[PDB]
Amino acid sequence: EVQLVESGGGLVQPGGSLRLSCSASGFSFNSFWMHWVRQVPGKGLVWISFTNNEGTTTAYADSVRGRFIISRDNAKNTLYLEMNNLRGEDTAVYYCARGDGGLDDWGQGTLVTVSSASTKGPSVFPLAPSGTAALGCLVKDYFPEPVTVSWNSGALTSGVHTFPAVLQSSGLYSLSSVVTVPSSSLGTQTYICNVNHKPSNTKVDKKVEP
Amino acid sequence: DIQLTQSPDSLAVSLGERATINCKSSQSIFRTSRNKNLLNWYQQRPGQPPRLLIHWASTRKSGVPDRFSGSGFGTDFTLTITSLQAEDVAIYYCQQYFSPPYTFGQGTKLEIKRTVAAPSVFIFPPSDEQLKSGTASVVCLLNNFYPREAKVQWKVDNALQSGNSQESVTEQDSKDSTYSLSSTLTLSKADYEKHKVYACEVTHQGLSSPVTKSFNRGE
Ligand SMILES: CC(=O)N[C@H]1[C@H](O[C@H](COP(=O)(O)O)[C@@H](O)[C@@H](O)CO)O[C@H](CO)[C@@H](O)[C@@H]1O
Numbered sequence: 157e158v159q160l161v162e163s164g165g166g167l168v169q170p171g172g173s174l175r176l177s178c179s180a181s182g183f184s185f186n187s188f189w190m191h192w193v194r195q196v197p198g199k200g201l202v203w204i205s206f207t208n209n210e211g212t213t214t215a216y217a218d219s220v221r222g223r224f225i226i227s228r229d230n231a232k233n234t235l236y237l238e239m240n241n242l243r244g245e246d247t248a249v250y251y252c253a254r255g256d257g258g259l260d261d262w263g264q265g266t267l268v269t270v271s272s273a274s275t276k277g278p279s280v281f282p283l284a285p286s287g288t289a290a291l292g293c294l295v296k297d298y299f300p301e302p303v304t305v306s307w308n309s310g311a312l313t314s315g316v317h318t319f320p321a322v323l324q325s326s327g328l329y330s331l332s333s334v335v336t337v338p339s340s341s342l343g344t345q346t347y348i349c350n351v352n353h354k355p356s357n358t359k360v361d362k363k364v365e366p
Numbered sequence: 367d368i369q370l371t372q373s374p375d376s377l378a379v380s381l382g383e384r385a386t387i388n389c390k391s392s393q394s395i396f397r398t399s400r401n402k403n404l405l406n407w408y409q410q411r412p413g414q415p416p417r418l419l420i421h422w423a424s425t426r427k428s429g430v431p432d433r434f435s436g437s438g439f440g441t442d443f444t445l446t447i448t449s450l451q452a453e454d455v456a457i458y459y460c461q462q463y464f465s466p467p468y469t470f471g472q473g474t475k476l477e478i479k480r481t482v483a484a485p486s487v488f489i490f491p492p493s494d495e496q497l498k499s500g501t502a503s504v505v506c507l508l509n510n511f512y513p514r515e516a517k518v519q520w521k522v523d524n525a526l527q528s529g530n531s532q533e534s535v536t537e538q539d540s541k542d543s544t545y546s547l548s549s550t551l552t553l554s555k556a557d558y559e560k561h562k563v564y565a566c567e568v569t570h571q572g573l574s575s576p577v578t579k580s581f582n583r584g585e
């Protein structure tokens with residue numbers, strides 16, 4: 157297998173509209189109820205809406221009723237959420253889930269950011285290394301979230317800590333990603349952080365060295 | 367609308383011990399015709415989508431360890447986790463599937479209590495590339511420590527800094543149950559060049575006395 161893939165999320169002005177999609181595969185889509193659940197970054201799960209098998213029975217949370225519309229296209233294996241008159245309180249990761257005994261399968265979610273702030277790509281700075289040694293990358297001054305960081309194209313995973321982003325005094329986010337390595341490998345092994353800030357189309361591969 | 371209240375909001379339980387998490391519904395969620403209590407339990411690990419554990423209050427989903435079990439009736443429900451493992455670090459939610467809106471409880475954040483582990487401390491000067499741009503970010507890393515509580519004090523030429531740093535902490539590691547923390551001191555290129563000694567002093571239960579890591583601006 158079951159795969160649920162949400163799309164359509166992004167930065168939108170307050171009062172604006174967005175349409176989310178959820179692609180389903182590995183099951184008989186038309187045989188199950190489908191739900192939308194949201195989660196404000198670092199807060200709890202909030203149920204938003206559901207539809208029965210044919211889209212003839214629908215319901216919504218009190219804070220979204222009259223603004224959102226759930227729908228499904230059974231022939232195209234797709235679930236939708238039309239969101240209108242968006243506000244700051246609608247900023248969240250939106251998940252689609254297949255209903256069975258409970259909400260059995262969930263997608264990775266799609267972030268919706270309701271703001272009048274501009275998209276801005278980050279600057280990527282090295283955190284130069286000094287037993288084991290630490291090095292990393294500082295991903296500074298971007299908006300909206302999220303940024304992803306991998307090391308050596310996903311080959312270096314051990315000892316990697318990618319910190320949660322922090323909102324700075326400026327209103328821009330910043331994050332660091334660090335890795336601990338043997339001081340022995342500082343000459344023989346190249347260390348590159350692969351940064352992607354998809355919201356601003358910014359892809360940076362930064363080589364970190366002494 | 368049915369309200370679900372979980373208790374406690376946060377819980378710290380030792381490895382190999384039993385965790386008890388409560389969920390109370392504002393009204394009954396027993397569907398007589400199906401003879402089922404319509405309560406679900408989810409585990410949401412750090413950075414991941416929720417995972418359904420149990421449905422119909424006591425029916426465990428296939429592939430979920432027998433260490434997880436649901437119990438209760440009508441308005442009082444319980445999630446039990448026996449022989450707590452490091453990978454159990456997550457926020458746990460209850461949800462009613464009785465009548466719309468299919469509401470969730472507020473979540474219970476489960477912390478895995480492990481032995482004390484002191485942080486490994488590292489300091490990073492601002493890069494030359496950043497310094498060209500007019501700002502200096504000085505980073506202090508506290509790696510793989512337990513418990514969460516840690517004091518990070520910045521010192522610029524032995525003068526203690528306050529109000530010019532920000533911290534970020536990782537979620538407990540799914541394998542070793544530790545935390546890592548970064549503290550970033552931000553100064554203008556002008557203020558950064560007016561000083562020599564940049565120090566990060568760390569206080570933690572695992573350290574007999576504070577560990578200070580420093581660098582000289584020029585060196
Ligand atoms: C609450 C619930 O379990 N919903 C499930 C539904 O169950 C229907 C409706 O339940 P209830 O509101 O009457 O309590 C139930 O009548 C079942 O006995 C029929 O399967 O079946 C659908 C699949 O058709 C699933 O997608 C959906 O999660």
Ligand SMILES: [Ca+2]
Nearest residue numbers: 374376377378
């Ligand atoms: Ca506790």
Ligand SMILES: [Ca+2]
Nearest residue numbers: 202203469470
């Ligand atoms: Ca809810």
